């Protein structure tokens, strides 16, 4: 019932909030955002995303860094950096989601919470990362 779009938005919010609450657990912040309106499956999916990003954060950040030509990863806004983290995780690790769905949904988050040029920014970089690092089987979807 909970839309996957809404589940994903919960993951992004937890990443965003954590940048200004580094004295709290990222997972615990997820539980705060998740409430009775979030399906069973959607809670499980969000926990999987956050767990998978946390455990692979070093690798994901390093991957994104290679494709940034302007502001390095640490200089991006919190929205842009974490949209890229979330979308990169999804591209690499969630097998049932088409590449264009991942990027389009990343863009909409970037447009909703970021600056005016955030949408175009993440579009450009995720297009590159998908082409060279998304599992090849995902190009069937």
Helical spans, DSSP H, in the chain: 4-18, 26-33, 40-67, 78-93, 99-113, 118-133
Resolution (A): 1.9
Residues with Cβ within 8 Å of 9's Cβ and at least 6 positions away in sequence, in order, are 109
Residues with Cβ within 8 Å of 54's Cβ and at least 6 positions away in sequence, in order, are 26, 27
- Technique used to solve these coordinates: X-ray
Give the span between the Cα atoms of 76 and 98, in whole angstroms.
26
Give the span between the Cα atoms of 130 and 141, in whole angstroms.
13
Give the span between the Cα atoms of 19 and 105, in whole angstroms.
21
Q: What is the CATH number of domain 1-141?
A: 1.10.940.10
Residues with Cβ within 8 Å of 106's Cβ and at least 6 positions away in sequence, in order, are 83, 84, 86, 87, 122, 123, 126
Burial of 39 (0-12, 13-18, 19+ CB in 10 A): middle
What are the CA-CA distances from residue 30 to residues 14, 18, 97, 98 (Å)? Answer: 5, 10, 22, 25
């Amino acid at each position: 019932k909970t839309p996957r779009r809404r589940m994903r938005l919960a993951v992004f919010k937890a990443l965003f909030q954590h940048e200004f609450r580094r004295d709290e657990d990222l997972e615990q912040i997820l539980e705060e955002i998740l409430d009775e309106t979030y399906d069973k499956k959607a809670k499980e999916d969000a926990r999987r995303y956050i767990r998978g990003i946390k455990e692979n954060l070093s690798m994901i950040d390093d991957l994104i860094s290679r494709y940034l030509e302007k502001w390095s990863l640490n200089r991006l806004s919190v929205v842009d950096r974490n949209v890229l983290r979330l979308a990169t995780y999804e591209l690499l690790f969630e097998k049932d989601i088409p590449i264009e769905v991942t990027i389009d949904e990343a863009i909409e988050i970037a447009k909703r919470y970021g600056t005016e040029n955030s949408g175009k920014f993440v579009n450009g970089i995720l297009d590159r990362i998908a082409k060279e690092h998304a599992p090849k089987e995902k190009f069937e979807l």
